[PDB]
From Swiss-Prot, chain A:
The gene coding this protein: Mrps31
Shown part of the complete sequence: 236 to 384 of 384
Domain of life from the UniProt record: Eukaryota
Protein name: Small ribosomal subunit protein mS31
Subunit details: Component of the mitochondrial ribosome small subunit (28S) which comprises a 12S rRNA and about 30 distinct proteins.
Protein family according to the UniProt entry: Belongs to the mitochondrion-specific ribosomal protein mS31 family.
Subcellular location: Mitochondrion
UniProtKB/Swiss-Prot annotation, chain B:
Span of the entire protein shown here: 306 to 457 of 685
Protein name per the record: Small ribosomal subunit protein mS39
Protein localization: Mitochondrion
Protein purpose: Mitochondrial RNA-binding protein that has a role in mitochondrial translation.
Organism: Mus musculus
Superkingdom of origin: Eukaryota
From Swiss-Prot, chain D:
Protein source organism: Mus musculus
Name of this protein: Small ribosomal subunit protein uS10m
MF annotations from Gene Ontology: structural constituent of ribosome
Record's subunit section: Component of the mitochondrial ribosome small subunit (28S) which comprises a 12S rRNA and about 30 distinct proteins.
Major site of localization recorded for this protein: mitochondrion
GO (cellular component) term, any one: mitochondrial small ribosomal subunit
GO biological process: mitochondrial translation
Curated annotation (Swiss-Prot), chain E:
Transmembrane segments: none
A molecular function (GO) term: structural constituent of ribosome
A GO term from the CC aspect: mitochondrion
Subunit composition and interactions: Component of the mitochondrial ribosome small subunit (28S) which comprises a 12S rRNA and about 30 distinct proteins.
Family: Belongs to the universal ribosomal protein uS3 family.
GO BP terms: mitochondrial translation
Native organism taxonomy: Eukaryota, Metazoa, Chordata, Craniata, Vertebrata
Record's protein name: Small ribosomal subunit protein uS3m
Main location: mitochondrion
Native species: Mus musculus (Mouse)
Subcellular location: Mitochondrion
Domain of life, source organism: Eukaryota
Keywords recorded for this protein, A-Z: Mitochondrion, Ribonucleoprotein, Ribosomal protein, Transit peptide
Length: 149, 152, 101, 140, 132
């Protein structure tokens, strides 16, 4: 008799041959859409039932460590590569191609390649400091027969 | 003043939703049914028609959508208790074993309302189906808040 | 408030040595070698001297974090022998017991 | 619960990828603690857990370490009178074998989350992989 | 004579608890450790930081529950979680404990940036091991 899905319908609308044609984020989430979502969450918001459900919520919030333990979780050094940390001679092009300054900077870049506590950006900054230092000391170097830049 | 005019007006808004190529969502139908709870006597045939259109469009009825149909077919202040409607039995068969998620602001209301209808009809078998639905998956999260959890 | 004025002075020495760590590293590197002209090395010997005295990291002293005691400190806990004994003798340090053998 | 029981409990979604899985030839788990009895209970819990998932496990007890240091007993003077303290570290090594990368993550998570207080783990995975494609063929 | 952590004999009228009765040389023999972390195990770091955090957590709980602590608190660190287990006398009303638990947990989680939980076991009165 009172069949839920058998009988006449309004028929104002038609079958959705095309579905969800406009994207859900038509614009950046507005205050109206941001607030309705918060209310939907409260609809199913019930208190913790055991220590598992509490730890699940802490994990979703980042409060509790993820397992298995990864000692480098969230620790990506600018998405670098091993070759960037190890091969640093590209940055010594401005320096003299030979001579005492080249011999010294070779030692500097050798240590920087073996430094696990510095990022590529910090390693480059050590190189740049010496470039500007010797430039300021152009006159003292020239007396010693060393030509810089 | 006139329901027939009022209903024809609300339908006109729906007709302009298709002229402008705007497709309705769950909230659109949920809003219409919540309004129909005022006219219990005359909203029964309109209310069922909406749910059939919901499936044809492809919108999936949520717990809130049934919460409104129950109110409209099982009034709390119902003098005519001699021959109550049987729709509650059909809905429970439809929702048997399904899992539901928060998709509206009246999802919590459904379970408290379903238990009330079971007590009114003095059918304990139906109460087990309603409670059994609450236990499937994580439906327990939609029982209700502090006021409605103790009533259920 | 820190424990005493001696702990405060040390705290500042530790915060100014961190600021001047890179600088004192780069300049001091120019002196700890035999590859650069001695004229440059003598000049870096003066730039390092010109930096503020509190930048020098050998003026830091390890003091008890709770009593600011200069000597008698244990570096693993940063506490003096006297303060460490109070916590150990009470079962408040995890795994520390008396040594009987 | 006597009469009220869940009907269809929700279970997490595990989707098989198309990437090949890691192959761990060995996986050494060195747990450390001040208390031997805690290691015995964890050794029982871990060995029982490994056996229930199909993992092959062996256990041995590395020699314990005791670190002793001396302190001065008096607050002032009285040099000759000292007090000595010690810390004891006890070890239990769970040597697992022939584990895929999915089996080693779920097992390590399960046993790492249940690591008692005062117990530290030192996992040492040993992966086995083919040779680099360049190395496979000498190229001049 | 050794005066360290010894509740000296009175005339038989001083009620000492199990923890108080035992001198330091019974640590690891008859009585255990009040704090359990992995920072004093061999080849482990951050002993200084765990020990300082404990000292504060003990002074904080005393002031937050003044006169309501029957015995010393027990601190348990697992992963980044901190757990405070305290025997508390039944002096205060029940709802006051719910306030102090919510307050002390939230405040200590935002101060050490770790999840902190408070576990309270209520006793009718202090438990006396022996009268000394
Ligand atoms: Mg010194």
């Amino acid at each position: 008799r009172k069949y839920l899905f058998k009988g006449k319908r309004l028929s104002i609308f038609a079958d959705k041959a095309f579905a969800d044609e406009p994207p859900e984020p038509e614009a950046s989430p507005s205050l109206w859409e941001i607030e309705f979502a918060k209310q939907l969450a409260s609809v199913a918001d019930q208190p913790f039932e055991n220590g598992f459900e509490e730890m699940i919520q802490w994990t979703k919030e980042g409060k509790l460590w993820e397992f298995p333990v990864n000692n480098e979780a969230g620790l990506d050094d600018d998405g670098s590569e091993f070759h960037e940390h190890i091969f640093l001679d590209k940055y010594l092009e401005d320096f003299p191609k030979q001579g005492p300054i080249r011999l010294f900077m070779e030692l500097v870049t050798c240590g920087l390649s073996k430094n696990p506590y510095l990022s590529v950006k910090q390693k480059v900054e050590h190189i740049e400091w010496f470039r500007n230092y010797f430039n300021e000391k152009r006159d003292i170097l020239k007396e010693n027969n060393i030509a810089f830049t | 003043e006139k329901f027939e005019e009022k209903w024809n007006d609300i339908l006109d808004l729906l007709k302009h939703m298709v002229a402008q190529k705007v497709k309705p969502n769950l909230q659109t139908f949920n809003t219409i049914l919540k309004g129909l709870r005022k006219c219990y006597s005359l909203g029964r045939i309109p209310a069922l028609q909406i749910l059939r259109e919901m499936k044809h469009i492809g919108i999936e009825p949520s717990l809130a959508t049934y919460h409104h149909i129950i109110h409209l077919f099982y009034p709390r202040d119902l003098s005519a208790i001699k021959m109550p409607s049987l729709i509650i039995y059909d809905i429970m068969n439809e929702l048997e074993g399904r899992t539901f998620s928060p998709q509206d602001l009246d999802d919590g209301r459904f379970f408290q309302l379903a238990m009330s209808v079971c007590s009114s009809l003095r059918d304990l078998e139906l109460a087990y189906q309603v409670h059994r639905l609450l236990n499937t998956g994580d439906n327990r999260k939609l029982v209700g808040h502090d006021p409605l959890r103790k009533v259920y | 408030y820190y424990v005493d004025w001696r702990m405060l002075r040390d705290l500042k020495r530790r915060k100014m040595a961190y600021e001047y760590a890179d600088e004192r590293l780069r300049i001091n590197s120019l002196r700890k070698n035999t590859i650069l002209p001695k004229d440059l090395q003598e000049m870096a010997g003066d730039e390092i001297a010109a930096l503020p005295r509190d930048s020098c990291p050998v003026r830091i002293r390890n003091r008890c974090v709770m009593t600011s005691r200069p000597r008698g400190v244990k570096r693993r806990w940063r506490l003096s022998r006297i303060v460490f004994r109070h916590l150990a003798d009470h079962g408040l340090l995890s795994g520390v017991q008396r040594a009987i053998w | 619960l006597h009469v009220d029981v869940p009907k269809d409990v929700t279970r997490p979604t595990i989707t098989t990828s198309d990437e090949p899985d890691t192959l761990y030839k060995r996986l050494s788990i060195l747990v450390k603690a001040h208390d031997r009895a805690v290691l015995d209970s964890y050794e029982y819990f871990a060995v029982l857990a490994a056996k229930e998932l199909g993992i092959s496990i062996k256990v041995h007890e590395p020699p314990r370490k005791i670190e002793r240091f001396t302190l001065l007993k008096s607050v002032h003077i009285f040099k000759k009178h000292r007090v000595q303290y010690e810390m004891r570290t006890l070890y239990r090594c769970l040597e697992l074998k022939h584990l895929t990368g999915s089996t080693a993550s779920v097992y390590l998570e399960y046993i790492q989350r249940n690591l008692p207080e005062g117990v530290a783990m030192e996992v040492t995975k040993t992966q086995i992989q083919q040779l680099p494609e360049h190395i496979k063929e000498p190229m001049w | 004579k050794n005066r360290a952590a010894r509740v000296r004999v009175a005339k038989g009228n001083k009620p000492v608890s199990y923890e108080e009765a035992h001198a330091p040389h019974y640590i690891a023999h008859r009585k255990g450790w009040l704090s359990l972390h992995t920072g004093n195990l061999d080849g482990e770091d951050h002993a200084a930081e765990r020990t300082l955090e404990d000292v504060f957590l003990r002074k904080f709980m005393m002031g937050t529950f003044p006169g309501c602590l029957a015995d010393q608190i027990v601190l348990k660190r697992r992963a980044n979680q901190v757990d405070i287990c305290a025997l508390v006398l039944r002096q205060l009303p029940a709802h006051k404990f719910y306030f102090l638990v919510g307050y002390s947990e939230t405040l200590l989680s935002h101060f050490y940036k770790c999840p902190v939980r408070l576990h309270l076991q209520t006793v009718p009165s202090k438990v006396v091991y022996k009268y000394i």
